[PDB]
Design a protein around this ligand. Structure first.
Ligand SMILES: COc1cc(-c2noc([C@H](C)NC(=O)c3cc(C(F)(F)F)nn3C)n2)ccn1
Ligand SMILES: COc1cc(-c2noc([C@H](C)NC(=O)c3cc(C(F)(F)F)nn3C)n2)ccn1
Ligand SMILES: COc1cc(-c2noc([C@H](C)NC(=O)c3cc(C(F)(F)F)nn3C)n2)ccn1
Ligand SMILES: [K+]
Ligand SMILES: [K+]
Lengths: 293, 359, 198, 67
């Protein structure tokens, strides 16, 4: 019947647990905040058992009171209702505080390290697959899409292989577009990026050509491959493809609706030569407006 | 206890000077410690910029596809489950590579060092001297392929200079540079294999598919749930691999020692379903594909066979065989000139007897 | 210069005039090798876009022609002969997804262009190199099959056509027996053909 | 006053369930408030990316010598 400090075995339990997590999941940052919580629990456990047992000689306090004292000094509160009044209980509190103040900042440093490493909804959604998203194109899409009362509940997923532009960020942290527009950095040719955007249950996929690209045939090939990949992944997803050059227009003929830029542009120019301001007529006919301008 | 801002109050200054000292001491601490904290975080910001039996992968630019291919092919073997991979790449880690490497499965198995094989410091950081294998891989994405081949040759030379007793697995793009890394344990030429497989596809259809499914480790469990019979059979037969075992120790071919190679191969296929494609005599170092009927098997030969599973792992089918309890093959046996091409374009081109024009 | 019936002509696979001049009506095979500079796209899987689109154009123009292509990424072999309005080709997508769920490295294998031998990827060479860490003989065996290295007394990969007159050999094992009793040839496998009207 | 981690102790629970209540409430605060703080700093990082008679200087690329 002699005191042997068994309560310190929670440290070994934590050591075994962290040795176990390294191999098996049971989840990247959760695994380490779990070790932080286990370290906190082990610290509180060791502290309360030490204070209670060492103050069995003086103040004759219960384990519940010791636990309450240890947690209220854990938060740096220090009520003073129950306080060690003897030599080694005070010294144990001292070393306990020092031990916590040396161990916990290491866990905090590991947590923020992992946080920095980690830094690098509803149904009826619509996916917009582009190559490089600009502010004007995004605003055009939003204005034309959300001008209809039936598509107010829809939210837009944007699959772009490039990182978000600053102006796109400024428009997307607007509260109106914050929860309606989801920006995924990925490619339609990878199936993982396709299931992240949930193409199989999507309402429509809009493949848009990059008019900014100097080489238009390369952009057309990329749009053809994106349309093919989306059709392969989600065959029952209507496609709205935008094609630059008419030669490549028969490769995406399977799509629900295909618009050729050059064909329409030059036909409208020719009609403007024939019927003046035909382009204005078509522009005002295909733009949703209440006629209040 | 007042350092940690606890302030129990059991012992508390009760006089003018001690209260003043506590006040000034608190002020001094709160003014002098944040300077140390700001210095510490400054140094932390400037600072931001295992086991044995490991394998080093020396590349120029690492992509997610190449890394996944290497991981799938490497860790598909039960013997290499304890190995961890060191990646020496002179470029910084790509975002997709980061996403795959912070997966818990690959977190502690893949180590990424930003460095070059031509610097010995990066070589000892990767612990090449005790490494099990160094994989020098060519950059197929590079526009200039001769420059990439030169870089791979220099990397192989540097690794050989640093760790001579480290087997090298070099990947060469152009055949002209294939004789500079001939010292390596295993060298694969991209162009040679690619164009030979294309030519054979022109000769024997789907030869490339045969080689692709023969060099890929698979249990043969693909398409086993399919309702189509062709998919089931195709995915079952795609699990075949080329295996080697000593003929004397081979339970497949041991009973056929002293017999002809063709007889042994046919009867092994008839009994167990293994395709004995070739052998290697112990006296020589050359592997012979189908030596022929005049070849007599010996207990010291190394027989190469195609089968779903290794003979060591086919103990289940051997125990099932135990649970079971045309002429016959014999156990023993403008005109064009034929010559080698005059001007071999590069060193290492194997001379092949070909149909040739008279002039 | 010493090889018989080996000619060259300047052109490309994207212009029909060059292929018609080389002769594609009488061409048994059309081997297309991707350009070295085409792999400069930031999106890695988009490096094969030009080759895939050109081969698809030639496949649409000449449906009966046999085109063999080499692709950089194995995930793009689904695009070699793309029939968008085809139920079987899109059920193969579900089959490939199911196989990929089980951790299969050979998820691309069930695609029709790959199974028929139309497309391969150089990633198989990397797989071969990693296999040689365990199977040191694998590279030598592969080169011997391709004829890249010639050791005297070593066989070569040939192919024989099973005609209607040889169907009295009802079984592959009986064919094995006949080959080993007549010409001592060892059959590796079968290139099977089925009717799959689209 | 126990919110600020001050703990005067002039008024302090002396019975068991009020003590357990302050214990669990401290734990709940320390587990629920850091989530709000991490959300706030996350939004702050995403956010990181006068008088009359003024004059506007419209340039394409501003250098030190020109300025
Ligand atoms: C203020 O916001 C915080 C503070 C902390 C914290 N980090 O270290 C400490 C002090 C030094 N240590 C203690 O309070 C202490 C003492 C004892 C015992 F007596 F040995 F039992 N056990 N503990 C845990 N607080 C953590 C989270 N949030
Ligand atoms: C809360 O988490 C922390 C807090 C601190 C800290 N920094 O400054 C102080 C206070 C102001 N000062 C004191 O406690 C104090 C008083 C005295 C003395 F009476 F003069 F002797 N000596 N000291 C050290 N706390 C540090 C680390 N972790
Ligand atoms: C030090 O600088 C700080 C600290 C905090 C803070 N975060 O958590 C706590 C403690 C753990 N909890 C408490 O104080 C507490 C207890 C109780 C109650 F008894 F249940 F009513 N209600 N509260 C709020 N402090 C916040 C801001 N600034
Ligand atoms: K296989
Ligand atoms: K196998």
């Amino acid at each position: 019947n002699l005191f042997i400090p068994v309560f310190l075995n929670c440290w070994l339990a934590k050591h075994a647990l962290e040795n176990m997590i390294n191999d098996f999941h049971r989840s990247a940052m959760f695994n380490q905040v779990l070790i932080l919580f286990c370290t906190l629990l082990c610290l509180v456990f060791t502290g309360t058992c030490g204070i209670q047992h060492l103050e069995r000689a003086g103040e004759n306090l219960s384990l519940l009171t010791s636990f309450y004292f240890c947690i209220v000094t854990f938060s740096t509160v220090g009520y003073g209702d129950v306080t060690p009044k003897i030599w080694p209980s005070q010294l144990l509190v001292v070393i306990m505080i020092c031990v916590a103040l040396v161990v916990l900042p290491l866990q905090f440093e590991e947590l923020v390290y992992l946080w920095m490493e980690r830094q690098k909804q509803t149904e009826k959604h619509v996916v917009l697959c582009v190559s490089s998203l600009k502010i004007d194109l995004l605003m055009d899409f939003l204005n034309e899409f959300y001008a209809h009362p039936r598509l107010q509940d829809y939210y837009v997923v944007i699959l772009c292989p490039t990182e978000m532009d600053v102006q796109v960020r400024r428009v997307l942290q607007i509260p109106l577009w914050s929860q309606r527009v989801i920006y995924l950095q990925g490619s339609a040719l990878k199936d993982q990026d396709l299931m992240r955007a949930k193409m199989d249950n999507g309402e429509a996929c809009f493949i848009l050509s990059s008019r900014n690209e100097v080489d238009r045939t390369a952009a057309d090939h990329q749009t053809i491959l994106r349309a093919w990949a989306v059709k392969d992944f989600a065959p029952n997803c209507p496609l709205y493809v935008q094609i630059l050059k008419p030669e490549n227009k028969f490769h995406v003929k399977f799509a629900d609706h295909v618009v050729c830029e050059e064909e329409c542009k030059y036909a409208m120019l020719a009609l403007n030569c024939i019927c003046p301001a035909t382009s204005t007529l078509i522009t005002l006919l295909v733009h949703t407006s209440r006629g209040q301008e | 206890v007042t350092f940690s801002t606890v302030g129990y109050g059991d012992v508390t200054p009760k006089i003018w000077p001690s209260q003043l000292l506590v006040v000034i001491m608190i002020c001094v601490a709160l003014v002098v410690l944040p300077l140390q904290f700001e210095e510490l975080v400054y140094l932390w910001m400037e600072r931001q910029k295992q086991t044995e039996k490991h394998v080093v992968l020396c590349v120029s630019s690492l992509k997610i596809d190449l890394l996944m291919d290497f991981l799938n092919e490497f860790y598909a073997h039960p013997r290499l489950q304890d190995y961890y991979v060191v990646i020496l790449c002179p470029t910084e880690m790509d975002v997709q590579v980061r996403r795959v490497l912070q997966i818990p499965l690959w977190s502690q198995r893949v180590i990424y060092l930003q460095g070059s094989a031509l610097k010995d410091q990066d070589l000892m950081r990767a612990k090449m001297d005790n490494g099990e294998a160094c994989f020098i891989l060519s950059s197929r994405n590079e526009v200039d392929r001769t420059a990439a081949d030169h870089q791979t040759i220099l990397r192989a030379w540097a690794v050989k200079d640093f760790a001579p007793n480290c087997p090298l697995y070099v990947q060469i793009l152009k055949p002209e540079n294939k004789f500079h890394v001939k010292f390596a344990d295993h060298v694969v030429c991209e162009e040679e294999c690619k164009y030979a497989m294309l030519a054979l596809n022109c000769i024997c259809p789907a030869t490339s598919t045969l080689i692709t499914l023969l060099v890929h480790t698979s249990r043969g469990q693909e398409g086993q749930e399919s309702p189509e019979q062709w998919q089931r059979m195709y995915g079952r037969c795609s699990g075949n691999e080329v295996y080697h075992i000593r003929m004397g120790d081979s339970k497949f071919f041991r009973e056929y020692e002293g017999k002809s190679f063709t007889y042994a191969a046919f009867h092994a296929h008839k009994k167990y379903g293994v395709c004995l494609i070739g052998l290697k005599r112990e006296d020589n170092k050359s592997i012979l594909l189908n030596p022929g009927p005049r070849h007599i098997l010996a207990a010291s030969d190394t027989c190469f066979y195609i089968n779903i599973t290794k003979e060591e792992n086919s103990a289940f089918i051997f125990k099932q065989e135990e649970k079971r309890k045309i002429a016959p093959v014999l156990e023993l046996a403008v005109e064009y000139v034929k010559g080698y091409p005059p001007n071999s374009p590069y060193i290492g081109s194997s001379p092949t007897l070909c149909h040739l024009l008279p002039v | 210069c010493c090889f018989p019936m080996v000619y060259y002509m300047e052109g490309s696979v994207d212009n029909l005039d060059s292929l018609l001049q080389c002769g594609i009506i009488y061409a048994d095979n059309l081997v297309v090798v991707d350009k070295e500079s085409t792999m400069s796209a930031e999106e890695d899987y988009m490096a094969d876009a030009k080759t895939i689109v050109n081969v698809q154009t030639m496949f649409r123009l000449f449906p009966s022609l046999s085109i063999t292509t080499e692709l950089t990424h194995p995930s793009n072999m689904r695009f070699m002969q793309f029939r968008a309005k085809d139920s079987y080709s899109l059920a193969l997508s579900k089959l490939e997804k199911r196989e990929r769920e089980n951790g299969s490295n050979l998820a691309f294998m069930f695609r029709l262009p790959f199974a028929a031998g139309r497309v391969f990827s150089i990633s198989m060479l990397d797989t071969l190199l990693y296999q040689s860490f365990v199977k040191d003989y694998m590279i030598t065996i592969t080169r011997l099959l391709l004829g890249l290295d010639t050791t005297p007394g070593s066989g070569y990969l040939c192919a024989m056509k099973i005609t209607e007159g040889d169907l009295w050999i009802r079984t592959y094992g009986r064919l094995f027996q006949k080959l080993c009793s007549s010409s001592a040839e060892i059959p590796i496998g079968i290139y099977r053909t089925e009717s799959h009207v689209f």
